[PDB]
Amino acid sequence: KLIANQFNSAIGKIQDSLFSTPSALGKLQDVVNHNAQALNTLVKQLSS
Amino acid sequence: KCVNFNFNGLTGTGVLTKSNKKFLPFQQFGRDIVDTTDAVRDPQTLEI
Numbered sequence: 842k843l844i845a846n847q848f849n850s851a852i853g854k855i856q857d858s859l860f861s862t863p864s865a866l867g868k869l870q871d872v873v874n875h876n877a878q879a880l881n882t883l884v885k886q887l888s889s
Numbered sequence: 890k891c892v893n894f895n896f897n898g899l900t901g902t903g904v905l906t907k908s909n910k911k912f913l914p915f916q917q918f919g920r921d922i923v924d925t926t927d928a929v930r931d932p933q934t935l936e937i
């Protein structure tokens with residue numbers, strides 16, 4: 842019973858941690874941002 | 890329709906539609922985030 846309760850509490854903590862911390866998924870947002878930069882730069886170079 | 894156009898010397902190809910952009914009486918052209926022309930004012934009717 843203790844093990845099940847600790848597990849359930851930890852899962853709730855995972856949801857609260859991800860919900861309340863905007864930076865938790867930064868690695869994936871960084872990948873998206875790098876691809877967005879690469880394409881915005883490639884298009885902007887056409888104006889040179 | 891997809892047409893060729895020449896607007897006061899501006900040459901290009903595209904599909905022209907009614908604009909909902911709010912240009913000031915002074916402004917004649919619009920550009921998006923990447924400095925690509927995306928709006929003109931008709932030289933005879935002043936339609937955007």
Ligand SMILES: *[C@@H]1O[C@H](CO)[C@@H](O[C@@H]2O[C@H](CO)[C@@H](O[C@@H]3O[C@H](CO)[C@@H](O)[C@H](O)[C@@H]3O)[C@H](O)[C@H]2NC(C)=O)[C@H](O)[C@H]1NC(C)=O
Pocket residue numbers: 843846847
């Ligand atoms: C090993 O550690 C666990 C905690 O990780 C101990 O269980 C915890 O025991 C405390 C009491 O010493 C519980 O607090 C009480 O909870 C009841 C809930 O109704 C509340 O009414 C009391 O006023 C008090 O707050 C705590 O909830 C409980 N935690 C879990 C997850 O069961 C366990 O006793 C420790 N074992 C040993 C041998 O030290």
